[PDB]
Symmetry: C3
Subunit: 211 residues, 3 copies
Amino acid sequence: MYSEQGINNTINISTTSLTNATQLTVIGNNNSVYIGNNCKIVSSNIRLKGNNITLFIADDVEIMGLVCSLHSDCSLQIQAKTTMGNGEITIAEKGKISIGKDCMLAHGYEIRNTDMHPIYSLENGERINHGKDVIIGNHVWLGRNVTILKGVCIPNNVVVGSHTVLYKSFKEPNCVIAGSPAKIVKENIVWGRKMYHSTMYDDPTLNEFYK
Amino acid sequence: MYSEQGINNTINISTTSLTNATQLTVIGNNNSVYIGNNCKIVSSNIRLKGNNITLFIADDVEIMGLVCSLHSDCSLQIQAKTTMGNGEITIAEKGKISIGKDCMLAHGYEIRNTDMHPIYSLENGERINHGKDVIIGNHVWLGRNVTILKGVCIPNNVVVGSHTVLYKSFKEPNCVIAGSPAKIVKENIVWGRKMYHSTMYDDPTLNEFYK
Amino acid sequence: MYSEQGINNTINISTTSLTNATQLTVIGNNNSVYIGNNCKIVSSNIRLKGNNITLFIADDVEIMGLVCSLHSDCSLQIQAKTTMGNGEITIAEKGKISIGKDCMLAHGYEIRNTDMHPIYSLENGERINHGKDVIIGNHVWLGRNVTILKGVCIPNNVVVGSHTVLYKSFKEPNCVIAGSPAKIVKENIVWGRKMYHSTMYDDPTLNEFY
């Protein structure tokens, strides 16, 4: 499991959550890790290197096979009830990525606020791919092998179709987004976890989205 | 190799077939598994959970690293001489997936008849993403990392270009399908297995496709 | 470094190069492998199976988790200072692939000169998909999960956007290529390795590009 090299690191992993086969490494200082009850954070590899990094995983989060790299002054926030399969999250350039509550992220997700390397214009020598924060709203379903790139904001209750690559933000909630270039392909929907709930009304979790 | 609980489950695996490192699990009633002669089903993980499930794999089929999950009243059918590398096939909502004769599936395929999770309309709360059968015709070649989703029928003698996602059926045979979105990019062709042949006429297996 | 079986194979790997966790397998005759100075080739699996194959890796190349398959009469050449993460290179049909200087290849690349199986036109029965050499120019950055197919030539100082598949060659240098089909999406650029420079003028390696 754990491996630290530094001082004033705060690691509070709630007592009920499980972290089987997970490696957590914190190199650096004034960092904080927080995992709530009753999380399942399994077969993952999480690296914090730097200072003043924040990793916050709320209650009731299940993650399996996450590779996570966090650099100095970055923060990853994952809200309650979010489930995640295999995937990768990279944060750099002192940015932030937030993932709202009750998300379902299917295997193969790649999420990042950065390209990790600079691209400059020959026209004026300036950098033009500065990193940008990623906001993934509440009740977002990412299908298989979805890629969410820097600065993309995803509204609440959105489904992203399998193998879709997102470069830009969308504003409309309750919609499905797929294709290349990524596009709204269906409007006025709500997804759920259980095919055994036959209408949206039979899923206690959904009441809010049709209010 | 296999574990099986329940009633009137029939498991017929020819003694001339190899199943090295494959796990087959059958839990339920009235399920049927057939694997024919001179097959090589290796390093695979195959699960049937439910009632009245049918798995049928014909002669001379070679599969390597298939992960396959079938739920009750579901069926998978793979006809003779088809070859498959690593990949995933998933069937739910009591549907069916068919793979025809002499198909060639490269490493990384994802095939399914279901989204695994419901999407409902905000207008009337009804489910709008019900599962739908998948039919992959005879002599279909799927390039690397191809995804075949619900409802998709693929005609005979078709090549699907690597990393292509199919959301919809096609009707034209003898073509190459590729891109995003998936479109016919070459017409009037026939594919074969062996690069050493000079022409299609040199490959007896191809007679039926050009007459 | 080697599990070398056959006749008249030459393997010259500089004593200053690290090969930790790497399987190099050479099965066949008259194959030659050159790896230059100060390379780091680790956790890779490089198989030369066949005869008369050449692998040439120049100085200061760094490779982590390459799965490489070469067949008879094929050639792979990787020029100085190139870096590669996990990925796959497949060469067949007696063809070649060449990667230029100071390229940066991110996790998930797939580079091939061959479809590995024939496609014939019904008009005349002839094969229409013969393998074709791949050329990646100098100072090309392949983003994550990029696929480069047969016959593709990439010009100097190009960035390929993540998840893009190239079926065709480009001619314009200094550009970003993305989408499907692959298109030039931004012209007149230059990329660098380290993002601690407000402008390109603080990267000495970039001077040759303006």
